Symmetry: D3
């Protein structure tokens, strides 16, 4: 129940499914999600992964009630994020890991790390400015204010915005187009893109990790 999984036309959709807890990532949901991605890489029945959330929220972030190392695994199959509502903090980081984002008109995005007195460890501080721009990333992180779907489209955080009821259809359409191409090339090319990106982001991700340790050390 806490994660749904379904495979149609070689596209597997993973759905975060604790809607009454606004899809917060508990220890259980983290293990199940990150495990489900790893399995999709090795499963010859799947070419593309779509990730989404049960409405009205995509992901509210880590289950802070309950409470952090990075776990997104190495994939050569593409992951499309179908963002159905608020993506906040660690939930925003999940969106940021996706290769391709599409958004409902209901999508919005926020970083509350500075608001709740924490620092990111899942790449926000690298990938946010990479994907929305330096100033917008800094405005988002320091104010903690929401970025709308329309503005996310403008800044290049998502590739498409559609009416709520069309969201999954749109993600499936992009996935069908991928599925219809040569998959040896899809994966070789995507693996190459990840390598080239990783080469630029490693140093920055190391610094994100060190900044978080130092912040935790002095607060303790």
């Amino acid at each position: 129940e806490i994660l749904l999984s379904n495979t149609e036309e070689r596209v597997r959709t993973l759905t975060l499914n604790r809607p009454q807890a606004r899809n917060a990532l508990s220890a259980a949901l983290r293990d199940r999600f990150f495990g489900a991605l790893a399995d999709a890489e090795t499963d010859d029945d799947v070419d593309v992964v779509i990730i989404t959330g049960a409405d009205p929220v995509f992901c509210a972030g880590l289950d802070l009630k309950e409470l952090i190392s990075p776990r997104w695994p190495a994939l050569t199959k593409p992951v499309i994020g179908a963002i159905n509502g608020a993506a906040v903090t660690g939930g925003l980081e999940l969106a940021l890991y996706c290769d391709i984002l599409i958004a409902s008109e209901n999508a919005r995005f926020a970083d509350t790390h500075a608001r709740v007195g924490l620092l990111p460890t899942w790449g926000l501080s690298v990938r946010l400015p990479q994907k929305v721009g330096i100033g917008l990333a800094r405005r988002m992180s320091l104010t903690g204010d929401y970025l709308s779907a329309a503005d996310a489209l403008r800044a290049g955080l998502v590739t498409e915005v559609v009416p709520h009821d069309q969201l999954l259809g749109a993600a499936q359409a992009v996935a069908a187009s991928i599925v219809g191409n040569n998959q040896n090339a899809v994966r070789a090319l995507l693996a190459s893109y990840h390598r080239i990106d990783d080469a630029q982001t490693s140093a920055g991700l190391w610094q994100e990790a060190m900044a978080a340790r130092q912040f935790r050390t002095s607060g303790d």
Copy 2:
């Protein structure tokens, strides 16, 4: 006839000219185009280059019938690309090399590498993310779908979209403004831009080349 070249008031326009083959880049057309850019760098009558294609396509890519090391030379004179229609795969890569792009309303852009079962070797895997964003580059490369002129503008791939018949006039206008500035500074600054950019892209282009070698090696 396959490449047209005209020099006017220190602006040289190179026109890919195989309209019936949608300006597909043959071995002969590669040699004339890349060679023309090299000649342009050292010709003292030239301050600025404009590249374009004979209608209705800018460049369909490599000539796949006939059938790929990089050959765009090191330049300190600016190259404005006037995209008059489809820029596909190899031809998107030509667009990506240009310092500044302006598009007809008819421009559209595509990467069909993964559709036809090849990996890029002219910088697409580096420059496309650089110029349209990671998300969109990945959506383009993996789908093979066209990005419209208007979306190219939004994403920052092109600086201007004008109606089709204003395209060259729009390119010549930008050229005139560059020519009207101090050419010593224009070249020193451009060289510096290239250097700073090259420092960021080198690693990535090497990884692009190795990925292509490994892919060609398995098949």
Copy 3:
């Protein structure tokens, strides 16, 4: 009077104030402005800095009538919001590029005249302009010298927001208020990290910018 400073509820606003000279940066105004950024970092009454200009220009660039211009934007851990009220040109475009966060008046516009006057930049334009507006737009800006409108800067990602002229400071103070409302140890530890991550990318470019500027000056000392 060439630089105004005012401090309201942990937000310090620095206003370049030579309106009749378009807020051109004379040596005196540079010493004043850069000195003021330095102080703000050490002042325990300040969490956020806003920089802006006296209408109608934000900043026309260096005082060329008055005129080796080394970089002087100091290491800060507090955010600096640029409220761009009008033209930011050349050095003044560089000041804007240094800001963490920009907000524009519909009156704002942006331009690089380094190639027009035949000089190369030493305050990071060659690195940060492509970084924050895209490569092709940066190259077209620098090489033509033409103005980028507020609408196009928003489209390009150079500013976060365009508002009507009389709302400009209101919009900067609203972002300021939200930052001030958050946990300031976290705000600073994150901004610092953001700055280290960015710096790790820009440093090789800034060195090459500086070497290019030295080489260009030295070959003109042969003309």
Copy 4:
């Protein structure tokens, strides 16, 4: 008693002190050692730190009998001289690699057993070992598990000096004295810069080291 600390004329010496257990780093000794480095940076009585071990081993590595080992060597601006009195193995080789400056007893020797015991490193061996002994020697060390003698470490550049065993601390304190005699604001501003320059190079490698270690643990959680 598991860690000795002594402070003499602005030089603090930290001696790993479980000789009969070869100065293996138990959780208690790690908390003690790393805590002590942290304190030294904030202590106004200390300009220079020397780390060494109780004879006959410098440090045998982590307490494996006792046994996710994240990096804990803190950001310091004061120099740390490693006086290597004997074997430094695996984690203990990593502690030595963290030092700014090494001096060895003829008794010192160095080894990486990560591949022998089937573990990957997370304290920077994969980055710093090639950095400070050369690529081929690092690869031969890590892959064979064999010992590198003091003589060969000097030849390779891993240590700055080899002395007779009973001169070891004398030689570390002599370097300490000279550093202490210099301008300490300059000593620290330069060391800090040295650390930023190095860090800009090592950071991408340290991240990749960490990811490799995560991937290796996760595929063994399938065995």
Copy 5:
């Protein structure tokens, strides 16, 4: 006959075998050598590779008579080079690819690229400075002089120098110790070393390749 291959107790030794042409790498010998390394990566009977040459030269470089893209494949199994004599130019580059080197007292090393009017394309301009120091790489490349086995040891190019007749035994000894360790960890660590190294060398190898293209272009 041109490449010898023997597998023993999970150690494979590849021997360049054109002694009369001083193991010069012909088109055919390149294909067999590079192909052999690729086969080695996927052969489950192999943990460690040793490369060496038939006496008296390790490798004289490319076969210049007959007459250069890089082709050393991505490996996670260690390659020990047993340098039995002269390693020159292309052949120095083979030595530089190896994870670990051991030398006969007869080994010597040279870069004759600038003497014969060529620029390197197999990583010399990156890996030589990396492995002997900047000063010495530059003295080597610009002079064309030999670096002796003993000096190679001092400078860190090789890990061990042994008398000529102990060379292979010295290489097999290191191989045995690697084989005796946990191979999962040995491969994961080696892959990680390669990755970390590749991250530092990519930009440089791209610049190496472009410098070679520009040089070939002017002549």
Copy 6:
């Protein structure tokens, strides 16, 4: 007089010549030296440059009595440093700029920046550890102690050490070997090496510059 210049067999030797001031670099000597290198690049009569000092010192560093931006120009011809005695501080930086070093038994090397309360601006803090190793560079910089010719050979700072009276002969021999090779290739290759090195050292040199400005700012 303050700089000597002589060209034999297409090898130009530049000799720092204020021996009674231990070849300290005054404003005049800086202009004349850095100008002399720039001229050698453009002078078709020259293939190699050797730099050295009038005995007993190579270079004591900047004329501190008198009192700093970097000025070593872009060269494609090789520069061999013939180090005849002490190379200290800015003088050590000069040695570090050379492509190839050879040393008299009289050579020694020192960094006194921390001793005299200054920070380097001519690349010491990048190139020292590049060429002698991280720990030795740190030992040298923080103690200010001399490194001998023998140890400099060991650490890889110089390529050769010879008796004092043989020093220039040795440099001329290495230069003759260069001169006898194909000069199009010598220069293309050396230009490529400089590009590859510059790519690794730029970020670090920028940080050296920033560290120096910040140190000067706080001391003022």
